[PDB]
Design an enzyme around this catalytic site. Structure first.
Site, PDB file in Angstrom:
ATOM      1  N   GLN A   1       0.863  -1.204   0.000  1.00  0.00           N
ATOM      2  CA  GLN A   1       0.000   0.000   0.000  1.00  0.00           C
ATOM      3  C   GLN A   1       0.891   1.242   0.000  1.00  0.00           C
ATOM      4  O   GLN A   1       1.788   1.322   0.862  1.00  0.00           O
ATOM      5  CB  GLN A   1      -0.916   0.004   1.220  1.00  0.00           C
TER       6      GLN A   1
ATOM      7  N   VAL B   1       0.590   5.831  -0.937  1.00  0.00           N
ATOM      8  CA  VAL B   1      -0.273   7.023  -0.688  1.00  0.00           C
ATOM      9  C   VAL B   1      -1.498   6.964  -1.611  1.00  0.00           C
ATOM     10  O   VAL B   1      -2.578   7.364  -1.151  1.00  0.00           O
ATOM     11  CB  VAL B   1       0.518   8.336  -0.865  1.00  0.00           C
ATOM     12  N   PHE B   2      -1.346   6.458  -2.840  1.00  0.00           N
ATOM     13  CA  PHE B   2      -2.337   6.604  -3.942  1.00  0.00           C
ATOM     14  C   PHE B   2      -3.095   5.302  -4.229  1.00  0.00           C
ATOM     15  O   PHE B   2      -4.070   5.353  -5.011  1.00  0.00           O
ATOM     16  CB  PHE B   2      -1.647   7.056  -5.231  1.00  0.00           C
ATOM     17  N   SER B   3      -2.664   4.166  -3.678  1.00  0.00           N
ATOM     18  CA  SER B   3      -3.196   2.839  -4.082  1.00  0.00           C
ATOM     19  C   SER B   3      -2.746   1.738  -3.123  1.00  0.00           C
ATOM     20  O   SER B   3      -1.852   1.995  -2.294  1.00  0.00           O
ATOM     21  CB  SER B   3      -2.765   2.506  -5.486  1.00  0.00           C
ATOM     22  N   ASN B   4      -3.359   0.558  -3.254  1.00  0.00           N
ATOM     23  CA  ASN B   4      -2.776  -0.731  -2.804  1.00  0.00           C
ATOM     24  C   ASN B   4      -2.636  -1.626  -4.037  1.00  0.00           C
ATOM     25  O   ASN B   4      -3.278  -1.337  -5.070  1.00  0.00           O
ATOM     26  CB  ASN B   4      -3.528  -1.378  -1.632  1.00  0.00           C
TER      27      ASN B   4
ATOM     28  N   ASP C   1      10.098  11.152 -11.174  1.00  0.00           N
ATOM     29  CA  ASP C   1      10.074  10.538  -9.818  1.00  0.00           C
ATOM     30  C   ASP C   1      10.851   9.215  -9.833  1.00  0.00           C
ATOM     31  O   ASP C   1      10.392   8.241  -9.213  1.00  0.00           O
ATOM     32  CB  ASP C   1       8.647  10.374  -9.288  1.00  0.00           C
TER      33      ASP C   1
HETATM   34  N1  LIG Z   1       3.596   2.674  -7.958  1.00  0.00           N
HETATM   35  C1  LIG Z   1       3.128   1.999  -8.987  1.00  0.00           C
HETATM   36  O1  LIG Z   1       2.648   2.534  -9.990  1.00  0.00           O
HETATM   37  C2  LIG Z   1       3.195   0.520  -8.937  1.00  0.00           C
HETATM   38  C3  LIG Z   1       3.676  -0.271  -7.936  1.00  0.00           C
HETATM   39  C4  LIG Z   1       3.642  -1.678  -8.275  1.00  0.00           C
HETATM   40  C5  LIG Z   1       4.088  -2.794  -7.539  1.00  0.00           C
HETATM   41  C6  LIG Z   1       4.683  -2.636  -6.199  1.00  0.00           C
HETATM   42  C7  LIG Z   1       5.835  -3.187  -5.726  1.00  0.00           C
HETATM   43  C8  LIG Z   1       5.988  -3.034  -4.341  1.00  0.00           C
HETATM   44  C9  LIG Z   1       5.133  -2.107  -3.822  1.00  0.00           C
HETATM   45  C10 LIG Z   1       5.076  -1.438  -2.494  1.00  0.00           C
HETATM   46  O2  LIG Z   1       4.223  -0.588  -2.250  1.00  0.00           O
HETATM   47  N2  LIG Z   1       6.021  -1.811  -1.616  1.00  0.00           N
HETATM   48  C11 LIG Z   1       6.355  -1.013  -0.437  1.00  0.00           C
HETATM   49  C12 LIG Z   1       5.648  -1.476   0.810  1.00  0.00           C
HETATM   50  C13 LIG Z   1       4.315  -1.129   1.031  1.00  0.00           C
HETATM   51  C14 LIG Z   1       3.640  -1.535   2.165  1.00  0.00           C
HETATM   52  C15 LIG Z   1       4.287  -2.299   3.108  1.00  0.00           C
HETATM   53  C16 LIG Z   1       5.607  -2.656   2.920  1.00  0.00           C
HETATM   54  C17 LIG Z   1       6.292  -2.256   1.785  1.00  0.00           C
HETATM   55  N3  LIG Z   1       7.622  -2.638   1.629  1.00  0.00           N
HETATM   56  S1  LIG Z   1       3.927  -1.685  -4.976  1.00  0.00           S
HETATM   57  C18 LIG Z   1       3.941  -4.048  -8.097  1.00  0.00           C
HETATM   58  C19 LIG Z   1       3.380  -4.234  -9.350  1.00  0.00           C
HETATM   59  C20 LIG Z   1       2.941  -3.165 -10.094  1.00  0.00           C
HETATM   60  C21 LIG Z   1       3.073  -1.882  -9.553  1.00  0.00           C
HETATM   61  S2  LIG Z   1       2.602  -0.396 -10.299  1.00  0.00           S
END
Ligand SMILES: NC(=O)c1cc2c(-c3ccc(C(=O)NCc4ccccc4N)s3)cccc2s1
Length: 338
Positions: free
Chosen positions: A28, A30-33, A148
């Protein structure tokens, strides 16, 4: 279906759009999960689904991202230049959902797993540097600024052999340049942005340079607290911003005095208060080579490559974007070629 903050209430085992079998939770922002799913309609092919928060502004950012992804994906039909592939989009309970190729790890998460202040093998950084320069090439051919680039917005496959640039929510066409000092995540933000000088594809090259240092050291190159601090940290590497460049800056008066002396804002150790120190000189003190080598004993082949990375970083992290290494020169660099 939607929580108080507008996030879709993801349940593992649920089906989206009567076809995407959700089996994994990826994260998850700021903008999505983001979830991992299999496509019931396409031989259970692995996909990632980004579910935008149920918010007008954030939905509109998502539609903007669709436009830039379509342009980059259409311009690279054989997928040679390392930009994330969008398969399609749909709406589910009023959430905009983007369906992507299955990647689940960003390079921030990879650095956190493979060490702390550790970094990746120099062979991996070489491979990743080439793939990032190929992404910059496609961006430039499409007249696009990502604006970014950072480890968080670079995805890797299971074997961590292939990276894809993702999140085009901050992207723009090179023409419509909002003169804003806050373009790009602060740590990865080029000095031309901060001083308010004309900027282009060079801001993404700068961001890649910052990223490459971080990939090998596991440390943010320029962890500045403010724009003024970012400039100080940049000038600790390269020395004072050239006079010609300062005078072009729309925001020059926030950072430099009438005689082009740097006005360094410091938070006093004693009081929690800001003070100013006028500096006519900034002596280069940032020891990049010593930083990249972690007082560590490397085999000579790897030692050669770290010196070459250092030379490449010197050519990327020129303060004047006009003096900065081109994408072509970067791809032909000894670090990548030897
Ligand atoms: N920003 C985007 O347009 C996209 C992200 C992805 C992903 C992601 C890969 C890993 C992601 C992430 O948010 N990890 C950080 C995190 C969040 C919450 C808790 C722990 C951690 N480490 S999201 C995958 C596939 C397509 C897109 S498009």
């Amino acid at each position: 279906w939607t929580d108080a903050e507008g996030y879709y209430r993801v349940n593992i085992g649920e089906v989206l759009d009567k076809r995407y079998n959700v089996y994994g939770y990826t994260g998850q922002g700021v903008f999505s999960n983001v979830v991992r799913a299999r496509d019931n309609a396409r031989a259970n092919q692995e996909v990632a689904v980004k579910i935008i928060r149920n918010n007008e502004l954030m939905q509109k950012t998502g539609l903007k991202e669709l436009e830039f992804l379509k342009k980059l994906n259409d311009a690279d039909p054989d997928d040679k230049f390392h930009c994330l592939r969008l398969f399609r989009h749909f709406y589910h309970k009023q959430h905009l959902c983007l369906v992507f190729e299955p990647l689940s790890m960003n390079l921030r998460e990879v650095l956190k797993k493979y060490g702390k202040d550790v970094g990746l093998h120099i062979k991996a950084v070489r491979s990743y540097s080439q793939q990032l320069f190929l992404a910059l090439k496609l961006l430039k051919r499409c007249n696009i600024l990502h604006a970014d680039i950072k480890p968080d917005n670079i995805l890797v496959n299971e074997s961590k052999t292939i990276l894809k640039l993702c999140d085009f929510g901050s992207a723009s066409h090179v023409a419509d340049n909002d003169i804003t000092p806050y373009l790009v995540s602060r740590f990865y933000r080029a000095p031309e942005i901060i001083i308010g000088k004309s900027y282009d594809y060079g801001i993404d090259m700068w961001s890649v340079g910052c990223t490459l240092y971080e990939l090998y050291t596991g440390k943010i190159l320029f962890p500045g607290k403010t724009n003024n601090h970012m400039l100080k940290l940049a000038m600790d590497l390269k020395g004072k911003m050239p006079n010609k460049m300062i005078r072009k800056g729309v925001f020059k008066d926030q950072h430099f005095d009438q005689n082009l002396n740097f006005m360094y804002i410091e938070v006093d150790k004693v009081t929690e208060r800001e003070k100013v120190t006028v500096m006519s000189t900034i002596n280069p003190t940032k020891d990049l080579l010593a930083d990249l080598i972690g007082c560590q004993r490397l085999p000579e082949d790897q030692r050669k490559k770290v010196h070459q990375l250092k030379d490449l970083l010197d050519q990327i992290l020129m303060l004047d974007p006009a003096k900065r290494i081109s994408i072509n020169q970067a791809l032909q660099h000894a670090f990548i070629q030897e």
